[PDB]
Amino acid sequence: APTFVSVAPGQTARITCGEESLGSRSVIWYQQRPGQAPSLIIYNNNDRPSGIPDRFSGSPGSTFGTTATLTITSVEAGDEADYYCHIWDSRRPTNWVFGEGTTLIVLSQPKAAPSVTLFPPSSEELQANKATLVCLISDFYPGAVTVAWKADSSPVKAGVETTTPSKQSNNKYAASSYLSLTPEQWKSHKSYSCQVTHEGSTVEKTVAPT
Amino acid sequence: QVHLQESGPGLVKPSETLSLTCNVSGTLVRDNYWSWIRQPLGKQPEWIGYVHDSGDTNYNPSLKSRVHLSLDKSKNLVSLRLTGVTAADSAIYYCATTKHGRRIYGVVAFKEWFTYFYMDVWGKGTSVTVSSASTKGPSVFPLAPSSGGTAALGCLVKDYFPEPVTVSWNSGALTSGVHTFPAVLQSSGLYSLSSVVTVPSSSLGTQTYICNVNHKPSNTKVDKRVEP
Amino acid sequence: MERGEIKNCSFNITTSIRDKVQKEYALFYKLDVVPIDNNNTSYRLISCDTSVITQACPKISFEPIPIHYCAPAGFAILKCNDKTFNGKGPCKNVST
Amino acid sequence: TRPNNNTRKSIHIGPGRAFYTTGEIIGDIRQAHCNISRAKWNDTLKQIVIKLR
Ligand SMILES: *[C@@H]1O[C@H](CO)[C@@H](O[C@@H]2O[C@H](CO)[C@@H](O[C@@H]3O[C@H](CO[C@H]4O[C@H](CO[C@H]5O[C@H](CO)[C@@H](O)[C@H](O)[C@@H]5O)[C@@H](O)[C@H](O[C@H]5O[C@H](CO)[C@@H](O)[C@H](O)[C@@H]5O[C@H]5O[C@H](CO)[C@@H](O)[C@H](O)[C@@H]5O)[C@@H]4O)[C@@H](O)[C@H](O[C@H]4O[C@H](CO)[C@@H](O)[C@H](O)[C@@H]4O[C@H]4O[C@H](CO)[C@@H](O)[C@H](O)[C@@H]4O[C@H]4O[C@H](CO)[C@@H](O)[C@H](O)[C@@H]4O)[C@@H]3O)[C@H](O)[C@H]2NC(C)=O)[C@H](O)[C@H]1NC(C)=O
Ligand SMILES: *[C@@H]1O[C@H](CO)[C@@H](O[C@@H]2O[C@H](CO)[C@@H](O[C@@H]3O[C@H](CO[C@H]4O[C@H](CO[C@H]5O[C@H](CO)[C@@H](O)[C@H](O)[C@@H]5O)[C@@H](O)[C@H](O[C@H]5O[C@H](CO)[C@@H](O)[C@H](O)[C@@H]5O)[C@@H]4O)[C@@H](O)[C@H](O[C@H]4O[C@H](CO)[C@@H](O)[C@H](O)[C@@H]4O[C@H]4O[C@H](CO)[C@@H](O)[C@H](O)[C@@H]4O[C@H]4O[C@H](CO)[C@@H](O)[C@H](O)[C@@H]4O)[C@@H]3O)[C@H](O)[C@H]2NC(C)=O)[C@H](O)[C@H]1NC(C)=O
Ligand SMILES: *[C@@H]1O[C@H](CO)[C@@H](O[C@@H]2O[C@H](CO)[C@@H](O[C@@H]3O[C@H](CO[C@H]4O[C@H](CO[C@H]5O[C@H](CO)[C@@H](O)[C@H](O)[C@@H]5O)[C@@H](O)[C@H](O)[C@@H]4O)[C@@H](O)[C@H](O[C@H]4O[C@H](CO)[C@@H](O)[C@H](O)[C@@H]4O[C@H]4O[C@H](CO)[C@@H](O)[C@H](O)[C@@H]4O)[C@@H]3O)[C@H](O)[C@H]2NC(C)=O)[C@H](O)[C@H]1NC(C)=O
Ligand SMILES: *[C@@H]1O[C@H](CO)[C@@H](O[C@@H]2O[C@H](CO)[C@@H](O[C@@H]3O[C@H](CO[C@H]4O[C@H](CO[C@H]5O[C@H](CO)[C@@H](O)[C@H](O)[C@@H]5O)[C@@H](O)[C@H](O[C@H]5O[C@H](CO)[C@@H](O)[C@H](O)[C@@H]5O[C@H]5O[C@H](CO)[C@@H](O)[C@H](O)[C@@H]5O)[C@@H]4O)[C@@H](O)[C@H](O)[C@@H]3O)[C@H](O)[C@H]2NC(C)=O)[C@H](O)[C@H]1NC(C)=O
Ligand SMILES: *[C@@H]1O[C@H](CO)[C@@H](O[C@@H]2O[C@H](CO)[C@@H](O[C@@H]3O[C@H](CO[C@H]4O[C@H](CO[C@H]5O[C@H](CO)[C@@H](O)[C@H](O)[C@@H]5O[C@H]5O[C@H](CO)[C@@H](O)[C@H](O)[C@@H]5O)[C@@H](O)[C@H](O[C@H]5O[C@H](CO)[C@@H](O)[C@H](O)[C@@H]5O)[C@@H]4O)[C@@H](O)[C@H](O)[C@@H]3O)[C@H](O)[C@H]2NC(C)=O)[C@H](O)[C@H]1NC(C)=O
Ligand SMILES: *[C@@H]1O[C@H](CO)[C@@H](O[C@@H]2O[C@H](CO)[C@@H](O[C@@H]3O[C@H](CO)[C@@H](O)[C@H](O[C@H]4O[C@H](CO)[C@@H](O)[C@H](O)[C@@H]4O)[C@@H]3O)[C@H](O)[C@H]2NC(C)=O)[C@H](O)[C@H]1NC(C)=O
Ligand SMILES: *[C@@H]1O[C@H](CO)[C@@H](O)[C@H](O)[C@H]1NC(C)=O
C-alpha cells in the first residue's frame, strides 16, 4: 500500500496494515530505517523484545474484522521509518511476503539548505583523455532538488547525470551529480558552475581550470 | 555479545545457482532456527524458508522448486543455494535467527493452535544482481581539496558493475566528516560514486590520506593519496 | 477432526417467485450431507431423496419444561415413597 | 458448548417463508465438546460397580 501518515512530535500515529482479520491472529511488526536491516518491533501482537519502549503497542490479535494497528505514542525524529507486518491468521494461511511499507513521517522538521562542494576533473583523470566534474549535495530538507550546470553563463545540456535524493540516516537527504566532459572542453571555458535549488533558494559553486 | 554477517557473489548470469553463506558468532548454529530473507529495492521483504539442525527444513511455496538450504557444524553457517535464477531474483538477501511460539486459540487436545515464527536479529545484507552483462572494476581518481581554517576533500570512484563498492578513508582511521555519496548508473550501464571528507586548514604535516576502495565482484583493491 | 465436517455448498433455487433461479451458497455439516457417484464437488442432503425434511420454526423451543401427569376423576395415581426401590416388587411406604 | 459464533442467514424460498442457515462464522473455527470432572465421573463409577457387583 502506497500509504504514509504524517504526524507531529508529541502526537500519536495510527499506522495500520494487512487485510482484515478472520480468526485469532498473531501479527509481528518490523521497522526499516533507510538502508538498514529491519529491526524487530513486536511479538505476538503487543509484547516486544529488548530495546523497544512502551510507546510501541499493537492491536490485540483477538478480534475479528479488524486490521492490524500499530500505535506510536508521542512520536519523535528517529521513529521515522518503513513499517511492515508479518500476519499470522488462524483461518488464512501463511504469509511469506510481508505487509505494506507504511511510511511514517513526522511533521515538524527544520527546513535545511544543502551543502554543495564542487570539484574539477583531477589532474590524474585528464592523463587518460577523460574529464568528469562532481557536485556533491549534502544534508538538506526536504529531499527534492533541481541541479543546473552552466559553462561560463551558458547552460550545459549533456554529460550531466544527476542522482535521486536518497535519504540520509538523519532526517536530512543527500544527492550527487556528475558532469562528464572532454579535457578540451574543460580547459576551453574559463569556468563551469553548479547551480542547486533548495528548493526555494538557488545557490551555486564555481570551479575554473588552472 | 552475539552477532553475524553474510557473504555473496554480487552478480550472476540468468543460468546457474546463487550460492550464499552466513557467519555466526556469539551463539551456536544448532540451537537456533534459521531463516533467509530477500528484499528488492523498494519492495517488501520476502520470507524464503527456514531450517534446523535436524534437517527440519521447509521453504516458501513459490520458490520451493528452486531454493535449497543447509547448515554445517564445522563451518557454522547458513548455506543457501538458489538455482535457476532470474532478473526478478535481483535483491538484497538477509540472514536472521528465528524464535518460535505457540498460539493456542481453542483446545490444545485436537490441534486448535497455530505455530508462528519471528526473526529477532538480522544480518547486514548482501547485494545480488542478475544481469547478462559481465563485471568491471572501478577507475579510481582522487579529488582536489584546495581551491582560513576550514576545508574539504574527496575521492572519485567510477565505471563499474555491479553495486556495491566499499570505501574507507585512510585504512579506516579517519571517520569524522566522511560522507560517501550514493552511486549513479551511467547510461552505458555502469555505476559511479565518490567519497568526501572535511578536514580543516591545519594539514601541512603531510597528513597521509588514502581512500581505500573495494569492489569484491572484480576482486580489485585501489587506494589513493590526495595532495594539493 | 479435519475431514471436512463443516462444508460450504452451492445450489440453485426458485425464490418466493418462479421468475428467479438464484444461485445461493450455504453451510452444512459432514453428517447432515451425503455425496453422489464419484466424489466430485457434489453432495446431497442426508435424507432428502428418501424423506421429508421439515425446518422446525425458530420461534418454538425444545427446552425441557418439567411435567406432571394429573389423574382423572374416579382414578388414582400411587407412589412408592421408599428410598431404595428395586423397580419391580412390593412397596411399603405408599401414598396417593 | 458449540464454541462457534454463528450468523443467521434467511434465504427466502417463499412465498411467505424462508430457510435459515449460518451465513458465516465470526471468529475462530472450533470443535464442540463436553467437559466433566474425571474424578467425579470415575468416583461415580465406583458407586456403580459396588451396586453392580
Ligand atoms: C473444557 O476443557 C478444555 C480443556 O481443559 C478447555 O480448553 C481450553 O479452552 C480455553 C478457551 O475456551 C483456552 O484458553 C486459551 O488459552 C490460551 C493459552 O493460555 C495458556 O497459555 C498462555 C501462554 O503460555 C505461555 O506464556 C506464559 C506467560 O504468559 C507462560 O507462563 C507459559 O509457560 C507459556 O510459555 C498463558 O499465559 C495462560 O495463562 C493465563 O491463562 C490462565 C487460564 O488458562 C490463567 O489461569 C493464568 O493466570 C494466565 O492469565 C493471565 O493472562 C490472562 C490473559 O491471557 C489475563 O487475563 C490474566 O489476568 C493473567 O494475567 C495459559 O496458561 C490463551 O492464549 C487464550 O487467551 C488468548 O486468546 C483468546 C483467543 O485466542 C483471546 O480472546 C484472549 O483474550 C487471549 O488473548 C490475549 O493473549 C493473546 C496471546 O497471549 C494475545 O495475542 C491477545 O492480544 C491477548 O493479549 C492481550 O490482552 C491481554 C489481556 O487479556 C493482555 O495481558 C496482553 O498484554 C494483550 O494486551 C485462551 O485463554 C485453553 O487453551 C483451552 N485448553 C486448556 C488446556 O485450557 C475448555 O475451555 C473447557 N470448556 C469449558 C466450557 O469449560
Ligand atoms: C462459501 O463460498 C462462497 C463462494 O465464494 C463465499 O462467498 C463469498 O462470501 C464473502 C462474504 O461472506 C463475499 O464477500 C466479498 O468480500 C470481498 C472483500 O474484498 C476484500 O479483498 C479485496 C481484494 O483483496 C486483495 O488483496 C488481498 C490482500 O490484502 C488478497 O488476499 C486478495 O487475494 C486480493 O489480492 C480488497 O481490495 C478489499 O479491500 C478494499 O477495501 C478496503 C476497505 O475495506 C481498502 O482498505 C482496500 O484498499 C480495498 O479498497 C477487501 O479487503 C469483496 O471484494 C466482495 O464484493 C465487493 O467487490 C465487488 C466487485 O468485485 C463489488 O461489486 C461488491 O459490491 C463489493 O464491493 C463493496 O463491498 C466491499 C465489502 O463487501 C467493499 O470492500 C468494497 O469497497 C465495496 O464497498 C461498496 O459498498 C459499501 C457498502 O457495502 C459502501 O460503503 C462503499 O462506499 C462501496 O460503495 C464481497 O464483499 C464474497 O463476494 C462471496 N463470494 C462469492 C463468489 O459469492 C463464502 O464466503 C464461503 N463461506 C465461508 C463461510 O467462507
Ligand atoms: C479415579 O480417579 C482418581 C482421580 O484422578 C484417580 O486417583 C488419583 O490418582 C492421582 C495420582 O495419579 C492422585 O494425585 C495424587 O494426590 C496425592 C495427594 O493429593 C492431595 O495432595 C496433593 C498435593 O497437595 C499437597 O500440598 C498442599 C499445599 O499446597 C497441602 O495442603 C496438601 O495436604 C498436600 O500436602 C494435591 O495436588 C491433590 O490435589 C490433593 O490435594 C499427591 O501426593 C500426589 O502427588 C505425587 O506423590 C504421590 C506419592 O506421594 C504419587 O503417587 C503421585 O503420582 C504424585 O507423583 C508426582 O511425582 C511424579 C514423579 O515426579 C510425577 O510423575 C507425578 O505426575 C506427580 O507430579 C498426586 O497429586 C489423586 O489424588 C487420586 N485421586 C483419588 C480420588 O484417588 C484414580 O486412579 C482413578 N481410578 C481409575 C480406575 O481410573
Ligand atoms: C445452477 O448451478 C449449476 C452448478 O453450480 C451451474 O452450472 C453451471 O452452468 C453453466 C451454464 O449455465 C456452465 O457453463 C457452461 O459450461 C459448458 C461446459 O460443457 C462441457 O461439458 C459438456 C458435457 O460434459 C462433458 O465434458 C465434461 C468435462 O468436464 C465431462 O465431465 C462430462 O462427463 C462430459 O464428458 C460438453 O458437451 C461441452 O462441449 C465441449 O466439448 C465438446 C466435445 O469436444 C465440443 O464439441 C464442444 O464444442 C465444447 O468444446 C468447446 O466449447 C467450449 C464452450 O465453453 C469451450 O470451453 C471448449 O474449450 C471448446 O472450445 C463441454 O465439454 C460450456 O459448454 C457452456 O458454454 C457454458 O460455459 C458451468 O460450467 C456450470 N458450472 C458452474 C459451477 O457454474 C449453473 O450455472 C447454475 N445456474 C444458475 C441458475 O445460476
Ligand atoms: C470418496 O470417498 C470414499 C470414502 O472416503 C471412498 O470410498 C472408497 O471407495 C473405493 C472404491 O474403489 C473403495 O476402495 C476399495 O479398496 C480396496 C482396498 O482397500 C484396502 O486398502 C486401503 C488403502 O488405504 C491405506 O492407505 C491409506 C493412505 O494411502 C491410509 O490412509 C489407510 O489407512 C490405509 O493404510 C493402511 O494400509 C496400508 C496398506 O494399504 C498400510 O501401509 C498402512 O500402514 C495402513 O495399515 C485401506 O484403507 C482399506 O482398509 C479398509 O479395509 C479394511 C479391511 O481390509 C478395514 O479394516 C478398514 O477399516 C477399511 O475399511 C483396505 O485395506 C480394494 O480392494 C477394492 O477393490 C476397492 O477399490 C473403498 O473401500 C471405499 N472406502 C469406503 C470407506 O467406503 C471413494 O473412493 C472416494 N471416491 C473418490 C472419487 O474420491
Ligand atoms: C414415608 O414417606 C413419607 C413421604 O416421603 C415420609 O414423610 C415425610 O417425612 C419428612 C420428615 O421425615 C417430611 O419432611 C418435612 O417436610 C415438612 C413440610 O412438608 C417440613 O416442614 C419439615 O422441615 C422440618 O425440618 C427442617 C430442617 O431444618 C426445619 O427447618 C423445619 O422447621 C422443620 O422442622 C421436613 O422437611 C416430609 O414432608 C414427609 N412427607 C410427607 C408427604 O408427609 C415418611 O417419613 C415416610 N415414612 C417411613 C416410615 O419411611
Ligand atoms: C567467516 O568467519 C571466518 C572466521 O571465523 C572466516 O574464516 C571466513 O572467511 C568467514 N566467511 C566469510 C564468507 O567471510
Residues A54 and A148 in one domain: no
D28 contacts B107? CB cut-off 8 A: no
Does residue A172 contact residue A112 with C-beta atoms inside 8 Å?
A: yes
Last residue of a domain, one of A43, A74, A106: A106
| CB-based contact, A159 to chain B, within 8 Å | no
Residues A65 and A161 in one domain: no
Rounded distance, CA C2 to CA D32, Å?
A: 13
Residues A97 and A133 in one domain: no
Give A38 to chain D, closest Cα distance, Å: 31
Ligand nearest to the CA of B74: 7
**Ligand 6 center from residue C92 Cα (angstroms):** 17
Does residue A15 contact residue A5 with C-beta atoms inside 8 Å?
A: yes
Q: Which of C21, C28, C56, C55 is nearest to C44 (CA)?
A: C28
Residues of D in contact with A91 (CB under 8 A): 28-29
Rounded distance, CA A197 to CA A195, Å?
A: 7
DSSP string covering A11-59, please? Answer: S-EEEEESS---S----EEEEE-TTS--EEEESSSS---TT--TTEEE-
Subunits in contact with chain C (3 or more CB pairs closer than 8 Å): D
Residues of D in contact with C16 (CB under 8 A): 12-16
| CB-based contact, B40 to chain A, within 8 Å | no
3 state DSSP class of A101: coil
Give B107 to chain D, closest Cα distance, Å: 8
Give the count of alpha carbons within 13 A of B30, CB side only: 3
Rounded distance, CA A37 to CA B139, Å?
A: 30
Residue to mutate (ligand 6; options C83, C84, C85, C93; most atoms within 8 A of CB): C93
Rounded distance, CA B41 to CA B91, Å?
A: 7
Out of C6, C13, C27, whose CB is closest to D21? C27
Rounded distance, CA B76 to CA B61, Å?
A: 27
Rounded distance, CA B224 to CA B155, Å?
A: 8
C-alpha cell at A30: 518490523
Rounded distance, CA A41 to CA D51, Å?
A: 64
Pocket of ligand 7 (CB under 6 A): B 7, 21, 23
Which CATH number is A79's domain given? 2.60.40.10
Subunits in contact with chain B (3 or more CB pairs closer than 8 Å): A, D
> Rounded to a whole number, what is the largest CA-CA distance in chain A?
73
Q: What is the dihedral of CA C19, C25, C29, C32, to 10 degrees?
A: 10
The type of residue at B164 is P
Enclosing domain of residue A136: 107-210
Main-chain dihedrals φ then ψ at residue B89, nearest 5 degrees = -75, -5
Residues A75 and A133 in one domain: no
CA distances (Å), A32 to each of A20, A84, A172, B2, C58, in order? Answer: 23, 8, 16, 21, 55
**Which positions ≥6 away from A189 have C-beta within 8 Å?**
A151, A152, A154
CA distances (Å), B177 to each of A198, B152, B153, in order? Answer: 22, 9, 10
Say yes or no: CB of residue C38 within 6 Å of ligand 5. Answer: yes
Eight-state DSSP code of residue A10: T
Are chains D and A in touch, 3+ Cβ pairs below 8 Å? yes
Residues A56 and A140 in one domain: no
| Number of domains into which chain A is organized | 2
Residues A75 and A138 in one domain: no
Beta-strand ranges (E) seen in chain B are: 3-7, 17-19, 21-25, 33-39, 46-51, 57-59, 67-72, 77-83, 92-104, 113-118, 126-127, 139-142, 153-160, 166-169, 191-197, 211-215, 220-222
Residues A12 and A102 in one domain: yes
B105 contacts D31? CB cut-off 8 A: no
Ligand nearest to the CA of D38: 3
**Ligand 3 center from residue D41 Cα (angstroms):** 17
Ligand nearest to the CA of A3: 2
Q: Quick one: CATH architecture of B133-228?
A: Sandwich (2.60)
Residue ranges per structural domain of chain B = 1-132, 133-228
C17 contacts D12? CB cut-off 8 A: no
Main-chain dihedrals φ then ψ at residue B108, nearest 5 degrees = -60, -25
Residues A117 and A49 in one domain: no
D3 contacts B110? CB cut-off 8 A: no
| CB-based contact, C16 to chain D, within 8 Å | yes
Does residue C7 contact residue C43 with C-beta atoms inside 8 Å?
A: yes
Residues A87 and A125 in one domain: no
Q: For cell 588514502, what's the residue?
A: B210
Out of C17, C24, C27, whose CB is closest to D14? C17
Last residue of a domain, one of A45, A77, A106: A106
Residues A131 and A149 in one domain: yes
Residues A73 and A127 in one domain: no
Residue A105, phi-psi category: left (phi > 0), alpha (psi -120 to 50), beta (remainder)? beta
B1-132: CATH number: 2.60.40.10
Q: Which residue of A has its CA nearest to B224?
A: A124
Q: Which residue of B has its CA nearest to A103?
A: B42
Say yes or no: CB of residue C25 within 6 Å of ligand 2. Answer: yes
Residue pairs spanning A and B at CB distance below 8 A:
110
- Residues followed by a gap in chain B, C→N > 2.5 Å: 147
